[PDB]
């Protein structure tokens, strides 16, 4: 198991534009296209992302290319985030994957909301962190995925993805 395999399980792979759990146009392996309700706007974003006129459909290789870019961007975003970087750097490799997963899904806008969870993670108070992480819109809206990610944060093992 590694971050790519983990996110591939959590995000799936679809080659046609679809709506994500939040109702937003997405393609590939969880590549968000836009929050616009206009499918044409999503198609424009797709064509821009791929560099050709796709009319809402891509290949597996193209999906994997977006996925590589998105994982890279998520990790690098963590390192550029003054709140996230020290916590991320404090973690072992498996728990780092949990952090990348959560950022991939949620982005960085809600970081301040996770101030207490982040502190508990940096303190290595794993059971306490796991309890706190579940007290969230994130958990309530995607509980099966959040349970897997939280188990990963709690244990530093891949048990939830076996
Ligand atoms: C989604 C970014 O906020 C943090 C990062 C990983 C752990 C808790 O939430």
DSSP string, 22-33: TS-EEEETTEE-
Cα 74 to Cα 104: distance, rounded to the nearest angstrom: 6
Is there an atom of ligand 1 within 6 Å of 99 CB? yes
Secondary structure of residue 14 in the 3-state scheme: strand
Distance 104 CA to ligand 1 centre (A): 10
Please name the helix (run of DSSP H) or strand (run of DSSP E) that holds residue 18, with its range, or none. strand 14-19
Ligand 1 atom 1 nearest Cα: 103
Secondary structure of residue 13 in the 3-state scheme: coil
* 129 within 8 A of 153, measured Cβ to Cβ: yes
Determine whether domain 1-162 maps to CATH 1.10.530.40.
Answer: yes
Resolution in angstroms comes to 1.3
Phi, psi of 18 (to 5 degrees): -140, 170
Cα 67 to Cα 60: distance, rounded to the nearest angstrom: 10
Ligand 1 atom 3 nearest Cα: 111
Technique employed here was X-ray
Nearest Cα residue to 126 out of 157, 105, 102, 100? 157
Cα 100 to Cα 153: distance, rounded to the nearest angstrom: 11
Nearest Cα residue to 7 out of 157, 145, 162? 145
State the alpha helices, DSSP H only, in the chain.
3-11, 39-50, 60-80, 84-90, 93-106, 115-122, 126-134, 137-141, 143-155
Ligand 1 pocket: which of 91, 118, 129 to mutate (most atoms within 8 A of CB): 118
What's the token pair of residue 82? 């003054």
């Amino acid at each position: 198991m590694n971050i790519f395999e983990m996110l591939r399980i959590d995000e799936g792979l679809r080659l046609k534009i679809y709506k994500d759990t939040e109702g937003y146009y997405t393609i590939g392996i969880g590549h968000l296209l836009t929050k616009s309700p206009d499918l044409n706007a999503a198609k424009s974003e797709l064509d821009k992302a791929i560099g050709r006129n796709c009319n809402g459909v891509i290949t597996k290789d193209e999906a994997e290319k977006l996925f590589n870019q998105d994982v890279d961007a998520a990790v690098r975003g963590i390192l550029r985030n003054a709140k996230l970087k020290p916590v991320y750097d404090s973690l072992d490799a498996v728990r780092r994957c949990a952090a990348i997963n959560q950022v991939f899904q949620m982005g960085e806008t809600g970081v301040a909301g996770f101030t207490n969870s982040l502190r508990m993670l940096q303190q290595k108070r794993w059971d306490e962190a796991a309890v706190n992480l579940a007290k969230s819109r994130w958990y309530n809206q995607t509980p099966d995925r959040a349970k897997r990610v939280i188990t990963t944060f709690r244990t530093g093992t891949w048990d939830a993805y076996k």
